[PDB]
Amino acid sequence: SDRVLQLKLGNSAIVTQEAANYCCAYGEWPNYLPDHEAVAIDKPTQPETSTDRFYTLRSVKWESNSTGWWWKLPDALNNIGMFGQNVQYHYLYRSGFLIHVQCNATKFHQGALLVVAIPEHQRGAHDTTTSPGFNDIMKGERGGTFNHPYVLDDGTSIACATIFPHQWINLRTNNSATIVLPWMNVAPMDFPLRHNQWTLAVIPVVPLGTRTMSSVVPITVSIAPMCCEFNGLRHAIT
Amino acid sequence: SDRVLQLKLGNSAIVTQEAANYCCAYGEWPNYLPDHEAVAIDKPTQPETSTDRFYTLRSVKWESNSTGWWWKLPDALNNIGMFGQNVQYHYLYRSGFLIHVQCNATKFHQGALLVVAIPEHQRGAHDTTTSPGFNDIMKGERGGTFNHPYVLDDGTSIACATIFPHQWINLRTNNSATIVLPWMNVAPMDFPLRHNQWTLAVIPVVPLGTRTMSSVVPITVSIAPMCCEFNGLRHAIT
Amino acid sequence: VESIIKTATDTVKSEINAELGVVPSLNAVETGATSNTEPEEAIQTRTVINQHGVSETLVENFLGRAALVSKKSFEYKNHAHKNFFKWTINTKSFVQLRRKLELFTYLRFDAEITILTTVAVNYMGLPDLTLQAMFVPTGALTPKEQDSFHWQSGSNASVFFKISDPPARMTIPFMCINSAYSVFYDGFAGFEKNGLYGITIGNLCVRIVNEHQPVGFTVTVRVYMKPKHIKAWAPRPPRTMPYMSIANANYKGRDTAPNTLNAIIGNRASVTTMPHNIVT
Amino acid sequence: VESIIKTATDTVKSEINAELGVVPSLNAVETGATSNTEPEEAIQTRTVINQHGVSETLVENFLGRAALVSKKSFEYKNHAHKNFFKWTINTKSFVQLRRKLELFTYLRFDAEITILTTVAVNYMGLPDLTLQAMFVPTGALTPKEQDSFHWQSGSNASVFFKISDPPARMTIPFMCINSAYSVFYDGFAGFEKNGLYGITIGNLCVRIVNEHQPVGFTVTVRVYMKPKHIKAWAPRPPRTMPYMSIANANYKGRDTAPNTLNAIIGNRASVTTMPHNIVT
Amino acid sequence: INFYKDSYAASASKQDFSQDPSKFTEPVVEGAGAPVL
Amino acid sequence: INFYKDSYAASASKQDFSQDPSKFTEPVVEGAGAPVL
Amino acid sequence: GVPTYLLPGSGQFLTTDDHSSAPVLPCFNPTPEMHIPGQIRNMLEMIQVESMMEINNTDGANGMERLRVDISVQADLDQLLFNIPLDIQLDGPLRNTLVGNISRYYTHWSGSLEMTFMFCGSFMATGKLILCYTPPGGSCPTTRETAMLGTHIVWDFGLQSSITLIIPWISGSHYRMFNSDAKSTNANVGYVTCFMQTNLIVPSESSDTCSLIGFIAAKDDFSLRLMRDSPDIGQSNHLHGAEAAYQ
Amino acid sequence: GVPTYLLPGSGQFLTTDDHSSAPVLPCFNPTPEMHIPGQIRNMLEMIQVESMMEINNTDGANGMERLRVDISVQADLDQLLFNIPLDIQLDGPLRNTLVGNISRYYTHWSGSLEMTFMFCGSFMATGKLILCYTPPGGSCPTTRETAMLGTHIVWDFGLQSSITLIIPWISGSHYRMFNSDAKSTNANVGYVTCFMQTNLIVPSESSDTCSLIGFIAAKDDFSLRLMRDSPDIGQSNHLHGAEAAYQ
Amino acid sequence: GTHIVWDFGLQSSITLIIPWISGSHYRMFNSDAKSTNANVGYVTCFMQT
């Protein structure tokens, strides 16, 4: 009964019949900014349903030699729907996220994906002293891929990545992962266009394999901002 | 009435009609490991009667020019009966010991043996800087002999050895010595194959003498482990 | 959930188990939760009153150690680094401290700074010089010369110390503009795209106040930092690849294992090979 | 049995004795017990209120003295022991301390460490150098050079002191993995037979932080240890034969008495010869 | 204690013995030996 | 007393005046001037 | 005035001392505290989270291939699949783990460890394995008959994907030590070996070679003592930009 | 601040001082105490245990032969068997004993000593001896008529194998001193001599030469003061391996 | 096995108890000495000294 789950936010809903319970990052849950923690004094806008809903990004194809994928939040959504609009029209934003990564195959398929939400995932470049550039970091909806997943592209290690909020999608066990992320920052709000609180990484620790009929096995990411708040209204930085 | 004594453990018993009371090392008595002193968390095995019984080692012949004998515990018993089996199959052991050294002669014989249980008797080699080797230390049931009993083969002195739990076997007085040894270590348990808590030393401070019919005068050692406990079960290190 | 832990948890004696529908040793890693199998459920245990303390692993203590954050040596002589230096403060120059700090995402702490000075002749004896360490916050003007007006330090905090005195020392309060320092920053410094990715405290300016002597000396200043009143958040995977720059997490890896980009752990003949097997 | 003793026991006056079946002066050494004959039973005594204190023989005091455990002198100069040394800690190098510690089988105590430094020119004056003593526990990496990264001491405990300051000092807690230190170990260090018999704390690494001077100096570091908060178990026969190695109890004895393997006490003409007989 | 006027100048705070491992070890919503699935 | 936070840093403990010589002098089980045998 | 005298240790700088010191910025008001998710107060909290063991640390295995152990349908019985060196001090499969990395900042440890293995083969794949923990003393067992005599768990692949092998704290001394001598009696923890209890059986359309991922973590009865610098990080030269900080 | 001034003695390092000092490892948790047999709290406990006197410290006696005094069936009466120099400071039969060794770590002593002799001849052997303690003042007595005038005990060989001679504390001063001058009035303790009270009589099949073992110990009225380094141990060079500790 | 160490002395005699150690309630006087329902075991005597 913890293998079945339905998520409903705004005008969107998702169900899964092969879940693995679900993770609440650091045991927290999203919430609006309380008066005793607030800084920006202008009255904020709380769009609710028009922004707190599931947004599904373009899928990626899980291949035998895939290294892994990543999407940075809120960058990945900064140009999608009303969430993107508010982000472009406001200097400050704040929100949690409900992440649902989905991937199904066959009972003859095997593979295991580590689905981890990394706070402040500051990437590193490989074999050079030059820091990563803007285009190396800001991929938007498309997201990026890992060059050296073994060290999470930052000189550390995927082996210890489990220290971060995560779940796995082990094909023989489940077909989706769900992670609820609360606001994660040292400030009550932030400027959405130049800083990413979380990075969603989906890495195939165990490659996709099977001896049955070969078919395209996609991986799809659906993300729903939660308890969105926006301050510092101005024109849009499209 | 303190010249007569019977010791009974498990299926073994010993009596002596010429004892000299008996020594309880440091006034202590063997006991099982209490919960508030325990370290190894696995449930231990307490064999009781199959291990807590008297084991008699091969005798030695007391000669006019003998220098003394020694047996290290638990090494001396690590290959005898069920005690030895448990020791070979477990990583950790713990136990006290009831030592009974016996030697009788004639009312025309004279001789005095110092029977002392030395804790942590770390041997030293003579006239060399090289530390004693494995075979110099691990003699098993046979035990070893002193090269320079005068200094207890460790650069100290037999004269002050009485500081350790002991008794004497003075032929005109008694024919046996009994010493009860409690667990002696800085740890609640230990690995039986590479460390000896006690060393039983029997040294003839006063040589054997007589003018009557000459006959072989043996010295026999019987040792009974007490309150045995074993932890860390695995295969046998035979 | 939350509770006060002063010692390692005790162990309770456990009995034989043969219960249907109860499989404590089975788990599901996919949930993201760590195995919750207790020793008492995996094997038969005895009762153990564990008195092992857990103080040394308190974050306050783990990070509560003075570590070298800066080391600079220069020539003290007649320059006809001119008898003083300016250091743009950062905590990414020395790997020992850096790696520990980077075990966390966010850190809030006051910083105890200790300054150690040594001198060597370029022998007639060692001079007991007086130095001035001035904290020049972001936006303030940094000294242009050994004797420029900046050193009158009317508002900046300065500390004057002699080489013969014990190392200088003072506490820098937690001074971030946020509730905690960002050990890692997945963002850019400016509103334009040409900005710097990742990762300002200011400049520590140190000079010898004494005028130059007839001969030259080499003076080395070592600065140590010890965080205290610490609060930490979101532990992270430890650094494995050698560091390359103080400005980023760029990596390359050692030339040969261990810690090569290709293999963090050194190789063994096979998965059935026991490296330091006991040959009794 | 157990009781609080603050002064030597008093003596009670005793009268004449002629009791049958009562022979206090007779004993049986074979029992292993020491004679329990009281002075009052051996001769006629008077009453004596003995006020002699017994404080100086308290174990805490007997062992509570700072003793030299390490002494190392090296050359402080341009090496083109390179201005630093690594000492594998042990308490068996100096006989005075060693013998006292070896009067016991087990010892539990915190250790107060004091470091004394002196220097000599190889005359233009003595430099007031700064040194760093770093405690490198078992398994940690030891410095390879006078200025290697190891010295940034991010977690190891280091103490920086000047030659002009009072000796450096700190307390090392009782740090055994057991309830007490094993002054003697009748066992081997490893699971294999080739292991070392008998008898790890770590390494004390000391360097001069100052760069080398134009001339050379000899620097000597003396380390002293004073145990405190002491608990001792199982007294032992004192060492008589001179020590040979720090790694074992090997013995050889002096060439001639006293303390020769053949005779610990020097000889006298005969058992009826009084050595320092008073010739009035 | 602390003789300076600013509280941040005080010595270390080594008394925070509270902890909640579960936020890292069991961040799952639905909480023995019963099948976790 | 002790101004350091760790109790092991304290000065010496010279007040343990209890003792039981008998554990070394009379380690015999069966306890005047009567024959010890 | 008050008569005083300086004690040895006066004027020294002990990196581990603990005293108050002059505040550089008097009357400074630190930023108000805010609640932030994931606060950690004791490093023990961190090492209780299981992380991946690099069990396949062999030549030919690159990157993540080193994190998974591949097992295939056997032709013989009671086959040994792999063993795990329990070296935390000496480089080994356990070194680069949360528990391993953090423990290496200390010298003494005590407590039970736990190894969890997740089977990542296809759903149609079945099998039973036996994971054994062998307390120290002898050579690492090479046959199931021998391994089977130690602490173990028989694992049946099924809906619950993972099994846990508790490595109970079984030591003579209260603590073990991270000795540079792997065969030391105060350091060696023993061995972990894995054998087929039965065999890995899969149908024609399933891969006949499957991977296992092993994780390890400390339990709450764990304790670490005597902090030291980790041997896992070093520096030979200045890092790029380190010197430019003075320019 | 507080006005102060440094006193003479400031900055010095007295090996016998007693102060607290900075803890190297903050928050370190020492291993829990466990009960261990044989705890000793005062060195006086140790010297109360009797140990063997090397009475036969003569040329020709090697090793343990020096620990036993051989007495044989006499042909004459009132024969002197042996005497014992009571030198604890000057090398003598009492020096290498528990009481002797430990006392030599001090300079002043006070209290009664006790000498116990155990007869180790055959059971069929009989005899009576007289052990005399002679307070200082003159020459060591050489005849029983003279020795007999001091503190003594007449010993009858029998079932109880051992006899005890109490050397009562008889001194003018509260303490005696371990002077390098054996004839000093503050050091000399007197003499102990042993004569045949009757004779050693044995039958044909018993050895006609028997040994005695002498032990000595302090009573509970003993006290030691003014600690010093023992003259019983020295060093001329580095011990083997001492220098290799730096390699 | 089950044993007693005997020291010759004033008490002239020693007793060795052969405790009833059997699987079955009773043993049998089988004409087959090696029968599992008949064989009682052995008694041996050695010099201790």
Ligand SMILES: Cc1cc(CCCOc2c(C)cc(-c3noc(C(F)(F)F)n3)cc2C)on1
């Ligand atoms: C990220 C991050 C940022 C920090 C703050 C480090 C602060 O340390 C500096 C500061 C602000 C001041 C001095 C300093 N040195 O001397 C003086 C004085 F002159 F004010 F005393 N201040 C030294 C360092 C390293 O820690 N982590």
Ligand SMILES: Cc1cc(CCCOc2c(C)cc(-c3noc(C(F)(F)F)n3)cc2C)on1
């Ligand atoms: C057996 C046995 C073991 C011991 C422990 C001796 C501990 O002494 C060492 C230690 C651990 C540390 C230092 C030390 N010196 O300096 C430092 C500092 F740098 F940490 F301060 N530590 C010196 C010695 C001799 O005592 N008996």
